[PDB]
């Protein structure tokens, strides 16, 4: 469909979410949904980003990958409707 | 307990999440959990931020309030365990 889920594994450090989102912001690229959770007994966190499927997305995944504190960035290996399901409980 | 939920209503525009998180980042203030959802049939979105209960938080709520595209910022008027509940389904 229209959107894509990007799943990031990042270091749970101050400022990594600003850097990740700044890459999108610097291009006026909107982010539709965000879920961020720490990983249990770990120094990392998971970031799920709901974004529109885009030609520019492949280049931006590359920028995200080179970021500081980002260890892995995945496209479309998560739950495609995960934000619809969360939305049933939070509005 | 240790943490606090900040609930923001913001314009669903590119770059607002970068600005919101940059205020925390500029102070090395960590953000523990994030949920961001668009509001149905609307031009806004909701941002829930899980942060440590802090003396500096009252000043930073003030900075967040003066931000561009932020219409409302609330402290502790949401679900205190909301990220624990999401965590049962997403890790
Ligand atoms: C958290 C997403 C916010 C509302 C906006 N869409 C942005 O790209 O910054
Ligand atoms: C999304 C939160 C990330 C992992 C980090 N805690 C930060 O403050 O930017
Ligand atoms: Co670091
Ligand atoms: Co705007």
This structure was determined by: X-ray
- Of the residues A14, A29, A45, A81, the best mutation for testing chain B's interface (the one with the most B CB atoms within 10 Å of its CB) is A14
Ligand 1 near B3 CB (within 6 A) = no
**Would you tell me how many other CB atoms lie within 10 Å of the CB of residue A80?**
12
DSSP B53-70: --TTHHHHHHHHHTSTTE
Establish whether residue A14 lines the binding site of ligand 2, counting it when its CB lies within 6 angstroms of any ligand atom.
yes
| Tokens read off for A77 | 């290996």
| Rounded to 5°, angle at Cα B21 from B72 and A31 | 80
Residue A68 sits in which domain range?
A: 1-91
| Matching residue, tokens 């949401």 | B78
Number of domains in chain B: 1
Kindly determine whether residue A48 and residue B90, on different chains, have CB atoms separated by under 8 Å.
yes
Per-position DSSP letters for B13-43, written without gaps between them: -TTHHHHHHHHHHTTT----EEEEEEPTTSS
Rounded to whole angstroms, how far apart are CA atoms A21 and A26?
Answer: 9
For chain B, the residue count is: 91
Cβ atoms within 10 A of the Cβ of A41, count? Answer: 5
> In this structure, what CATH number is given to the domain that contains residue B63?
3.30.70.260
CA neighbor of B1 nearest in space, from B49, B48, B50, B53: B53
Closest partner CB to B14 (pick from A18, A29, A46): A29
- Going by their DSSP bridges, the two strands A70-75 and B70-75 should be labelled as unpaired
C-alpha closest to that of A17 among A90, A77, A87, A67: A67
Half-sphere exposure of A73 (CA within 13 A, CB side): 18
Alpha carbon distance B39, A55 (integer Å): 26
Taking CA atoms only, the protein residue closest to ligand 2 atom 2 is B31
Cβ atoms within 10 Å, residue B86: 21
Quote the tokens at residue B25: 């980042």
**A21 touches A6 (CB < 8 A):** no
* Residue B30 neighbours by CB under 8 Å, 6+ apart: A12, A13, A14, B24, B51, B52
For residues A46-73, one letter each, b for 16 or more C-beta atoms within 10 angstroms of the residue's C-beta and e for the rest, the string is bbbbbbeeeeebeebbebbeebebbeeb
Q: What is the DSSP letter of A39?
A: P
């Amino acid at each position: 469909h229209d959107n894509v889920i990007l799943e990031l594994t990042v270091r749970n450090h101050p400022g990594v979410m600003t850097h990740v989102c700044g890459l999108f912001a610097r291009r006026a690229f909107n982010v539709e949904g965000i879920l961020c959770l720490p990983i249990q007994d770990s120094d990392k966190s998971h970031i799920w980003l709901l974004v529109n499927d885009d030609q520019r997305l492949e280049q931006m995944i590359s920028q995200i990958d080179k970021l500081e504190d980002v260890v892995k960035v995945q496209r479309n290996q998560s739950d495609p409707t995960m934000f619809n399901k969360i939305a049933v409980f939070f509005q």
